[PDB]
């Protein structure tokens, strides 16, 4: 039949590539509600006049009075439609912090909630999952949707090791040394149209590869110890699964996202066409090295972490946006966005308590922010 | 919660691995009865004394006279021991056409049938076929293993395509020219799997690949068109499936026969240690490159004698085992076997019918080693 899908953070990456692929199957999906940011007001309206969807929110007040027929605008106006509106799939891609609400509030309605948002579970952590129902979560990212692929060659009893692979971003090999000369421009600053700032400079770092890790743990419910990381240049491998047997199980695709969205959103049931497959009519290596992680210490990092448990996962992150924002800016250097992040981490205890309310995560990313702010800053 | 298995080929690299997963795991398993040819004896003994099961077949009736109280002696010996064992899973790890008459008398008990013996399906086919319930043929070689671990990867409807690896042989890359004058020492170099002479060759004439391409299509049912051979030299993905999404789900494991050999016994449940692990600790690549189709056309000759069906599939295996023992012999040449097989299947017309009987099969058996014998006259 056909699946209702909202899609939160319709402007963006994750959300644009959804639409395409619910427009190519109109048998499979239909879109019945749309949310975005404010920032790109003139690309939602566009999507309402393309798609013919009237149910749309728009969480900016000020960017809503350009309108004048936007059924829910302000703070809050996404959750509001996800009260609101009858649905099969909540697909949140929004950015940061106001991605959290939503995801409660749909899980709530019981809807299947394709996530794309970071914040929702490196955050929000306890609070989500004490939400959340079995197998209500479905994972947008290309890592955790090949490990949902890859578990299902045997029960979760005969799960060894879950292993993701990681590109090892622009630096892989560099030494410590290498390290201290990187440029914002080599990190892979640049005004992409595509992205966020962060996403590329994350992923340099290996502090994307951390945040991967803790996502992993909270989503397949398997312990840190049993959470390896591999680099794996190609990116034809997104991630595997090792069984009690010694048998690994692997998922492989030439890297395109609407593979993992697709899948996502008709879960669990495969898209036909979504992507395109591996070519074995031509030559091709994959390779696999271990991390060094004495150079990259931001998965160990994010492991203790974890481990630590409660906000712990909240001060993790809230202090690399600020560590590595201050890279970006010229007032670090590179190795002290993971050497901030420790500093940070290692003065956080008090925030090891599990969170009541959103509140308390909130509480927990504010505090983190002016340490690390302290830390750059030298005050 | 016990499974009592009967092992047949129990002296042969096979049926020696089997044994001691089945002694590693007594809780999963026990040994209620062995077969064997008689030319290890040796190790008959060795495996009397240490499982205890007096229960034994032994073809040869010299053998059968030494070892002793031997219950089952001659060509018969195997197809009765399996008929009156109460077993849940029976073992065929005989060799050639021997493995025939055992293979149907196991069906034909309810017994699951783990299936080394590539004989009796490929010459056996629809007889064989027609004798089983579904999923009571459950494989023992690597490929196959891999497959149906990697079928869990979705619903039937959403198999696009299996892809088989081969090792590519010793003369992988090799020139056509190159392969006239190979001797049957280059030929039976370095075995990537623990067999002798026969196994080896059929590996460096990718007929081995071809044969395997045949099980493939009767054991899942898959068409021929959908399912590919790749190389891949390192031998660590055993095989794959890509979906029509676009996702292809692989099985990796270090060569070791203990882990499909253990899968196969106590299918669907993994057997806990059974094999190491792929290392992601060190590094590693995985190689993929096409079959030189030209040069070996042995898959292709397969994939024709399949689509005849009948008892053609029984054909291109008999005369495979005539001109590689004409090979080994020194009575012929290296790319002379797969041109006899071909010789042989142009003249076959007549076979393919489908058989109602064994008979019929070695009808068709005895027909192709005349013929073959016919072609290596002939040079």
């Given at each position: 039949g056909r699946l209702r899908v909202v899609v939160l953070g319709s402007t963006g990456s994750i959300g644009t590539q959804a639409l395409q692929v619910i427009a190519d199957n109109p048998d499979r999906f239909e879109v019945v509600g749309l949310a975005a940011g404010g920032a790109h007001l003139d690309t939602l309206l566009r999507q309402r006049a393309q798609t013919g969807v009237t149910n749309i929110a728009v969480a900016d007040e000020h960017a809503a009075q350009?309108?004048?027929?936007?059924?829910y605008h302000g703070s809050d106006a996404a959750t509001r439609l996800v009260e609101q509106t009858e649905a099969d799939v909540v697909l949140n891609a929004l950015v940061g912090a106001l991605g959290l609400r939503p995801t409660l509030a749909a899980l709530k309605t019981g809807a299947r909630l394709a996530l794309?948002?970071?914040?929702?579970?490196?955050?929000?952590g306890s609070l989500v999952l004490r939400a959340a129902r079995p197998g209500q979560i479905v994972p947008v990212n290309s890592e955790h949707s090949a490990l949902a692929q890859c578990?299902?060659?045997?029960?979760?009893?005969?799960?060894a090791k879950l292993v993701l692979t990681a590109?090892?971003?622009?630096?892989?090999?560099?030494s410590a040394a290498d390290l201290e000369h990187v440029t914002p421009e080599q990190a892979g600053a640049h005004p992409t149209w595509?992205?966020?700032?962060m996403n590329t400079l994350n992923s340099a770092s290996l502090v994307n590869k951390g945040l991967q890790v803790i996502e992993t743990h909270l989503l397949f419910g398997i312990p840190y110890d049993r959470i390896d990381v591999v680099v794996h240049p190609?990116?034809?491998?997104h991630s595997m699964v090792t069984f009690i047997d010694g048998s690994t199980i692997a998922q492989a695709s030439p890297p395109d996202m609407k593979l993992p969205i697709s899948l996502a959103l008709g879960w669990p049931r495969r898209v036909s066409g979504a992507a395109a497959a591996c070519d074995f009519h031509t030559a091709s290596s994959w390779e696999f090295e271990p991390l060094d992680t004495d150079v990259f210490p931001a998965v160990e990092l994010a492991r203790q972490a974890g481990v630590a448990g409660g906000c712990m996962t909240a001060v993790y992150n809230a202090a690399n946006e600020e560590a590595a924002a201050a890279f970006l800016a010229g007032r670090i250097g590179f190795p002290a966005i993971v050497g901030i992040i420790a500093d940070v981490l290692h003065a956080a205890d008090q925030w090891a308590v599990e969170p009541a309310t959103v509140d308390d995560v909130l509480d927990a990313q504010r505090w983190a922010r002016e340490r690390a702010q302290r830390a750059v800053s030298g005050m």
């Open positions: 350009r309108v004048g027929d936007i059924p794309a948002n970071k914040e929702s579970l490196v955050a929000g578990l299902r060659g045997g029960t979760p009893d005969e799960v590109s090892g971003g622009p630096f892989r090999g560099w595509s992205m966020g700032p190609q990116s034809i491998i």
